[PDB]
């Protein structure tokens, strides 16, 4: 619930990420799309 | 498609995010989405 739409879906953003990198074909997309990764990641742990 | 996948799908984290954020009460959230906010301006406004 409150947290598909700030987690659940960066997960395909992440994802989606990957299919753009190639066809957008450079490497900063993979840095954005890593960079949020860890940002995504606080909330796919939230403490533990 | 690309960006439709990774600007129209991202402003609406950015916005769900807002949503979650008074009632999640950590300011971390706007933090965070604060810098996902310019990850997605590179998408938006791809200069370079």
């Given at each position: 619930?409150?947290?598909?739409?700030?987690?659940?879906?960066?997960?395909?953003?992440?994802?989606?990420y990957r299919?753009?990198?190639?066809?957008?074909?450079?490497?900063?997309?993979?840095?954005?799309?890593?960079?949020?990764?860890?940002?995504?990641?606080?909330?796919?742990?939230?403490?533990?």
């Amino acid at each position: 619930d409150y947290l598909r739409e700030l987690l659940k879906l960066e997960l395909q953003l992440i994802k989606q990420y990957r299919e753009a990198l190639e066809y957008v074909k450079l490497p900063v997309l993979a840095k954005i799309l890593e960079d949020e990764e860890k940002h995504i990641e606080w909330l796919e742990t939230i403490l533990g």
